[PDB]
Amino acid sequence: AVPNLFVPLNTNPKEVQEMRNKIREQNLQDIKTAGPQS
Amino acid sequence: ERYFDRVDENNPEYLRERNMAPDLRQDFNMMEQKKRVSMILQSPAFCEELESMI
Amino acid sequence: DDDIAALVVDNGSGMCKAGFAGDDAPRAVFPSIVGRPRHQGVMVGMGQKDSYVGDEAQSKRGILTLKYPIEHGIVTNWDDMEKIWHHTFYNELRVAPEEHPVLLTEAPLNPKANREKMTQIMFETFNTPAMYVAIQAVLSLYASGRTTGIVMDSGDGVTHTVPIYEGYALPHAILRLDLAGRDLTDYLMKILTERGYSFTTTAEREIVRDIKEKLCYVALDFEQEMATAASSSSLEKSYELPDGQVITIGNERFRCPEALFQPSFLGMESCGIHETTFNSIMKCDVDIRKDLYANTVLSGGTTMYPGIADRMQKEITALAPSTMKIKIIAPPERKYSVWIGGSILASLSTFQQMWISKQEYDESGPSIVHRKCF
Amino acid sequence: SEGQVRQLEEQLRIMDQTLKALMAAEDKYSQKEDKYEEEIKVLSDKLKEA
Amino acid sequence: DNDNSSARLFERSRIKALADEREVVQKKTFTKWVNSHLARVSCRITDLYKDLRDGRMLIKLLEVLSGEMLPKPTKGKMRIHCLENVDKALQFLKEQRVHLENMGSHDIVDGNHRLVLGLIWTIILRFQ
Numbered sequence: 001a002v003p004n005l006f007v008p009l010n011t012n013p014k015e016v017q018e019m020r021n022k023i024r025e026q027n028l029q030d031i032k033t034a035g036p037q038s
Numbered sequence: 039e040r041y042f043d044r045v046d047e048n049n050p051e052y053l054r055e056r057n058m059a060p061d062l063r064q065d066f067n068m069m070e071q072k073k074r075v076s077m078i079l080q081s082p083a084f085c086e087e088l089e090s091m092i
Numbered sequence: 093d094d095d096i097a098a099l100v101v102d103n104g105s106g107m108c109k110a111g112f113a114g115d116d117a118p119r120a121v122f123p124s125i126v127g128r129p130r131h132q133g134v135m136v137g138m139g140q141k142d143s144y145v146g147d148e149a150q151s152k153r154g155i156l157t158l159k160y161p162i163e164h165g166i167v168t169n170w171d172d173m174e175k176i177w178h179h180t181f182y183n184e185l186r187v188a189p190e191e192h193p194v195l196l197t198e199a200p201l202n203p204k205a206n207r208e209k210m211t212q213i214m215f216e217t218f219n220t221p222a223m224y225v226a227i228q229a230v231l232s233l234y235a236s237g238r239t240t241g242i243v244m245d246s247g248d249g250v251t252h253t254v255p256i257y258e259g260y261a262l263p264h265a266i267l268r269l270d271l272a273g274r275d276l277t278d279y280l281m282k283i284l285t286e287r288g289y290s291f292t293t294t295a296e297r298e299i300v301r302d303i304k305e306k307l308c309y310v311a312l313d314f315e316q317e318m319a320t321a322a323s324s325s326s327l328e329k330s331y332e333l334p335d336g337q338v339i340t341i342g343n344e345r346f347r348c349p350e351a352l353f354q355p356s357f358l359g360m361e362s363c364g365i366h367e368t369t370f371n372s373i374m375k376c377d378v379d380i381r382k383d384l385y386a387n388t389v390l391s392g393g394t395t396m397y398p399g400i401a402d403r404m405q406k407e408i409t410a411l412a413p414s415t416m417k418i419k420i421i422a423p424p425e426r427k428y429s430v431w432i433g434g435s436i437l438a439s440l441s442t443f444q445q446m447w448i449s450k451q452e453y454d455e456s457g458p459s460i461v462h463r464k465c466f
Numbered sequence: 467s468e469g470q471v472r473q474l475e476e477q478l479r480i481m482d483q484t485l486k487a488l489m490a491a492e493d494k495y496s497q498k499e500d501k502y503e504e505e506i507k508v509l510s511d512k513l514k515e516a
Numbered sequence: 517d518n519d520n521s522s523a524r525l526f527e528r529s530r531i532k533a534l535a536d537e538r539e540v541v542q543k544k545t546f547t548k549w550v551n552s553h554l555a556r557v558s559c560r561i562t563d564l565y566k567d568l569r570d571g572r573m574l575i576k577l578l579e580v581l582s583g584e585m586l587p588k589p590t591k592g593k594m595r596i597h598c599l600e601n602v603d604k605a606l607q608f609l610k611e612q613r614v615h616l617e618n619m620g621s622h623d624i625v626d627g628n629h630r631l632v633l634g635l636i637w638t639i640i641l642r643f644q
């Protein structure tokens with residue numbers, strides 16, 4: 001059994017697309033951000 | 039712009055339009071063309087017979 | 093949690109890429125080579141440098157012998173891999189490995205000891221709080237942005253096809269072919285001999301790779317292009333060596349990548365990449381094939397040859413039934429696509445559940461990686 | 467020569483920033499067109515069935 | 517060639533821009549951190565890449581941080597004496613079992629930005 005072992009269940013598919021679109025939008029605005037401060 | 043005019047996700051009972059089999063598309067139209075349920079109820083002579091028999 | 097971003101490291105056979113989560117492009121991209129000197133050292137007071145790794149190993153390649161730690165997607169030498177990881181973490185990104193989790197990528201069909209040793213190295217030495225291992229071709233679908241499709245990833249070490257339908261991957265239809273740009277570079281170095289040019293050292297292999305990246309393309313029809321090349325000299329191009337000598341590649345330009353479609357030029361018995369993709373499609377069920385026909389995704393640096401998409405579409409259309417519609421999706425950023433997918437996977441709020449904690453590793457040894465991940 | 471170099475660098479940056487918008491518009495136009503394709507073929511199938 | 521041009525555009529714009537912003541910020545912060553400790557003696561550096569070439573200021577910084585006496589620099593102004601002075605600091609770091617990778621004297625002398633920044637970062641991770 002356990003076909004869904006590697007992934008969690010009952011997750012909204014829209015959120016992944018929204019965050020992918022956000023990463024896409026970062027290129028169009030090409031805002032330059034420094035790395036996180038240690 | 040038809041595509042701006044209406045949105046598939048705005049109305050679920052318009053969303054039913056997209057996901058229909060063709061023979062299911064005929065069955066609804068033909069069956070509400072016939073109006074059998076209206077015919078049986080509106081016709082009295084069969085109606086009170088069914089009433090009293092039950 | 094909010095300001096802390098997990099590091100994303102794409103680790104292929106050819107080049108290593110690294111950056112932060114939530115970024116569109118990787119911060120550090122550099123070749124994965126480790127070079128060592130071979131000649132006499134006579135000037136006293138210049139200092140001692142035992143090993144050269146990364147981009148500045150390429151700059152001084154004249155006096156070095158170059159070794160690749162990863163061969164065919166397998167880490168043959170682990171000490172050099174530790175050198176590459178240390179140079180990535182400290183010199184390239186200037187981040188402490190304790191601060192952030194690490195996301196790694198690998199080939200689909202690999203020996204188990206590779207994954208176990210990756211987990212052991214990233215916990216025992218660099219002391220990371222969490223780590224995850226994923227498949228490159230799965231991350232390519234994240235970068236594409238679609239739920240379903242078949243991914244053909246071709247890098248420097250290995251080529252592989254995986255199909256995914258509705259977020260479900262079929263393990264029995266995953267196909268692996270040991271035919272990448274490494275063997276294409278070797279084939280180009282072999283076929284450049286018949287024009288009088290000889291490259292033998294490991295330093296000249298980088299020159300051959302540069303020649304391949306600058307003056308190669310895929311012909312749409314092989315026999316017609318061969319007849320055209322025999323008839324006229326319009327196909328010839330000139331390249332300049334680092335010492336100022338000029339060579340003329342001529343006929344070889346469309347013959348080096350043609351070994352991807354016909355492996356019999358290399359003596360291999362295996363099928364071409366188009367036949368491999370078609371066979372991976374027909375190994376799936378009947379119903380999903382149409383969708384798998386419509387969302388073929390190209391990835392990896394080997395698929396950057398001009399005209400690869402048209403030839404692939406023509407071959408798949410010839411193999412497939414005529415009533416289906418065949419299109420090949422190749423973004424311009426298909427060299428870095430895997431890394432982008434990793435960032436998209438690393439920044440999800442749900443994926444914070446799926447990290448492998450250090451306590452779980454301490455309980456379960458290096459065998460925890462097979463139970464999680466994929 | 468130095469002044470000419472850096473002013474032309476500024477020109478190059480401005481012009482690539484110009485090209486990126488055309489890239490985005492191309493992508494979103496194609497993503498608009500494909501669903502029109504998928505719509506007309508289904509509706510034509512319905513018409514033939516009728 | 518069109519998609520090849522687009523790929524060159526992408527890896528010319530974004531990969532360069534993010535790395536250059538990060539290294540500029542790191543350069544300013546490392547300059548302030550070095551200037552704070554180097555102000556105990558009468559020493560100050562304006563540029564991290566240029567003033568660290570001669571190898572004297574690296575010796576002064578390591579002397580301030582560690583607290584014992586390193587060997588005095590080789591008395592010279594040539595390239596060979598410069599390499600010797602940087603190698604002295606690198607060998608003193610080899611005493612403290614601090615792990616440096618892809619670090620040589622000529623890399624500091626020539627002025628490679630990433631390796632100098634990595635050396636400063638490694639020193640910060642050790643001596644804080």
Ligand SMILES: Nc1ncnc2c1ncn2[C@@H]1O[C@H](COP(=O)(O)OP(=O)(O)O)[C@@H](O)[C@H]1O
Nearest residue numbers: 104105106107247248273305392393394396397
């Ligand atoms: N612009 C290009 N055109 C054609 N082939 C390329 C190009 N760039 C890289 N390659 C090929 O791809 C290989 C590098 O692939 P890469 O993306 O580094 O694979 P991985 O990252 O999976 O190791 C090189 O050896 C070369 O053969």
